[PDB]
Amino acid sequence: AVDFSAHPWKAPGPNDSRGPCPGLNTLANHGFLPRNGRNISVPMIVKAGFEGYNVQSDILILAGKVGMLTSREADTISLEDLKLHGTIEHDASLSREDVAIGDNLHFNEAIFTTLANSNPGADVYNISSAAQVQHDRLADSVARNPNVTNTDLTATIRSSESAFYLTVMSAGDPLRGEAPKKFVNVFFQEERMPIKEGWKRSTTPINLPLLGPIIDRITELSDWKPTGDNCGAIVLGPGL
Amino acid sequence: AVDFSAHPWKAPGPNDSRGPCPGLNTLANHGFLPRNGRNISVPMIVKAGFEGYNVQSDILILAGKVGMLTSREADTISLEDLKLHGTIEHDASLSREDVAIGDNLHFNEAIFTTLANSNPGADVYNISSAAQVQHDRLADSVARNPNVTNTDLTATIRSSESAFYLTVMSAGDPLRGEAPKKFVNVFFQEERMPIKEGWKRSTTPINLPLLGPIIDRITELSDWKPTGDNCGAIVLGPGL
Ligand code: HEM
Ligand code: HEM
Ligand SMILES: *[C@@H]1O[C@H](CO)[C@@H](O)[C@H](O)[C@H]1NC(C)=O
Ligand SMILES: *[C@@H]1O[C@H](CO)[C@@H](O)[C@H](O)[C@H]1NC(C)=O
Ligand SMILES: *[C@@H]1O[C@H](CO)[C@@H](O)[C@H](O)[C@H]1NC(C)=O
Ligand SMILES: *[C@@H]1O[C@H](CO)[C@@H](O)[C@H](O)[C@H]1NC(C)=O
Ligand SMILES: *[C@@H]1O[C@H](CO)[C@@H](O)[C@H](O)[C@H]1NC(C)=O
Ligand SMILES: CCCCCCCCCCCC(=O)O
Ligand SMILES: CCCCCCCCCCCC(=O)O
Ligand SMILES: CCCCCCCCCCCC(=O)O
Ligand SMILES: [Mg+2]
Ligand SMILES: [Mg+2]
């Protein structure tokens, strides 16, 4: 009963709220979430992620309610609210700069180069390439950001995000933990579902049982180590 | 204008969900929240706290959305869900036991003795008595619970809770940070608004600007120090 032809991609206008998350931004750009990116609740996110990507309520409720903390409203956010550093938003992003040394909100092609150039010799990104990218992005933050934060929690969130692009933008079974570069690149660079390019919503549900072993393997292959205090404390609201 | 005659106290039935919070339990017991204690949203908490206690949306949105993390639902909790240790629920409670060594959910008269016996020779509890109680309760946990968690965050939450009973159950201006023992005792022991005893909803709004100096003073007088790592990390959801 979901009609993708009734969900065309449209570029956001200058006052349409967009955040640091390509997943939610893409849903908004197709009208699965409000195109203005505002007044978004967790039930709305659950429905949009199901309809758009076949992502299940388990992960979207867990992440969604943490995301709600970033606004001043009782039960909604704007997508831009999610840029709040140290709730979910973190250093060593795949396509954004660290907030201490740049723009933690907008897609940045220079940052994205690392991901774009990963898995040489193949037309997919996969678990080993995803891990290499995480290793390299963290190394970049440690090199260049004097305020870098790197904890078990940020590392887990980062692997979760890599698992998302490998699964949601997959061509075959999302279980395989690989996704066409052509699909993933459109997802990040244009925050668009690559429909003309051949992408289709997964027919396999993407939930925590599916993602968990992928996340853990990405972490394992990334050669991640604690670097500092390692306290997994999140920011509980804006303006504290 | 709030009609308290239309909000009578009724004892919870066997299937009514109740949690570790006397504030929310009392609102449920008067039907300001659903008497069954289920499917409770942050907007419902905001409205109930305003109507019942004149507590404003600043504190209830902030605390409410953190409380939402304790359930598996998109935008509601059951009151019992709030017992989840390490989200809001903490050791050295005023009226509950530490989860590692007892029941962190139900009112416990033996624990409550410390509060009940505080401020000898006055008919109010006040900021100095509240601080002494927090000191003594923490000392008890440090003595008897080898797994005690005691951090900047838990200390702040604890002082916030003491500030709540001093203000919401006040007779005079809540600014004064003192409340009749007869009112506070009914609040904890029966999770009832002490209307027959003479209590009335504050005509002064109770918000973060009002609570903040009370919180800080309680902490200052309590001779507080952190335990161990002093890591302000919360549990982000159940079953992790
Ligand atoms: C469930 C609700 C969601 C919330 C609240 C959320 C929130 C966020 C936030 C705050 C970030 C920024 C982290 C950072 O890079 O600093 C982010 C990144 C990301 N999210 Fe989401 N997200 C959600 C769902 C999704 C979904 C459904 C996808 C699907 C593919 C997704 C894919 C991503 C990816 C790939 C990134 C990494 C961007 C980068 O590192 O540059 N997210 N998310
Ligand atoms: C006017 C509103 C409220 C009042 C007056 C109030 C009052 C209190 C008090 C006095 C305690 C301490 C109980 C003790 O130490 O034995 C407490 C504990 C608690 N409250 Fe509230 N509360 C209010 C709102 C909230 C809200 C909105 C939430 C979350 C949605 C919440 C969650 C809790 C939790 C989880 C505890 C347990 C902490 C612990 O003792 O371990 N409260 N509350
Ligand atoms: C936000 O959404 C709620 C729920 O649908 C609605 O009642 C409210 O009017 C909306 N506000 C705006 C500004 O659109
Ligand atoms: C990822 O693809 C590369 C190149 O095809 C391959 O060498 C590597 O084994 C793959 N890793 C996984 C986990 O499939
Ligand atoms: C960031 O690091 C610099 C250099 O160490 C330091 O002066 C500054 O206080 C830090 N800022 C934050 C946000 O901690
Ligand atoms: C209400 O909470 C119950 C658990 O108490 C949960 O099963 C249900 O999905 C929630 N939703 C509704 C429809 O009330
Ligand atoms: C609390 O009451 C006691 C006894 O009346 C008094 O000694 C003490 O100074 C009071 N403290 C405050 C903060 O008012
Ligand atoms: C296995 C744990 C995954 C959930 C981590 C906490 C919530 C953050 C959501 C991660 C997804 C995202 O950030 O896009
Ligand atoms: C300013 C840091 C506090 C962050 C919010 C956590 C919960 C606030 C405590 C509210 C009182 C209560 O738990 O009943
Ligand atoms: C319930 C905890 C929330 C905040 C507790 C610590 C700060 C005191 C209140 C904030 C005062 C203010 O700046 O308006
Ligand atoms: Mg980031
Ligand atoms: Mg407790």
Author numbering:
A (entry chain A), B (entry chain B): -3 to 236
Question: What sentences appear in the manuscript?
Answer:
Here, we introduce a close ortholog of MroUPO, a UPO gene from Marasmius wettsteinii (MweUPO-1), that has a similar reaction profile to MroUPO and for which we have set up a directed evolution platform based on tandem-yeast expression. As a member of the heme-thiolate-containing peroxidase superfamily, UPO activity is fueled simply by H2O2, which plays a dual role of oxygen donor and final electron acceptor. In general terms, long UPOs are monomeric proteins with a molecular weight of ∼44 kDa and with a strong preference toward small aromatic compounds due to their narrower and “carafe-shaped” heme channel (e.g., AaeUPO vide infra). By contrast, short UPOs are either dimeric or monomeric proteins with a molecular size of ∼26 kDa per monomer, harboring a wide open and symmetric cone-shaped channel (frustum) that dictates their preference for bulky substrates like steroids and long aliphatic compounds (a preference attributed to MroUPO, see below). Here we present a new dimeric short UPO that can be heterologously expressed at high levels in both S. cerevisiae and P. pastoris, an enzyme that shares its substrate profile, selectivity, and biochemical and overall structural characteristics with MroUPO.
Long-chain substrates, alkanes (dodecane and tetradecane), and fatty acids (myristic acid and lauric acid) have a conserved “buried” mode of binding in close proximity to the heme. This type of binding maximizes the hydrophobic interactions between the main part of their corresponding chains to multiple residues establishing the contour of the heme channel (Ile55, Leu58, Val62, Thr152, Ile153). It seems apparent that these hydrophobic interactions govern the binding mode shared by all of these ligands, as the two alkanes fail to establish a polar link to MweUPO-1 residue Glu157 made by the carboxylate of the fatty acids. Indeed, while most UPOs can hydroxylate fatty acids, mainly at the ω1/ω2 positions, the progressive one-carbon shortening of mono- and dicarboxylic acids is a feature exclusively observed for MroUPO and MweUPO-1. Here, the captured lauric acid confirms this capacity, with its carboxylate coming into close contact with the heme and enabling shortening. As such, the results obtained by soaking MweUPO-1 crystals in lauric or myristic acid may be explained by the dependence on chain length described for monocarboxylic fatty acid shortening by MroUPO.
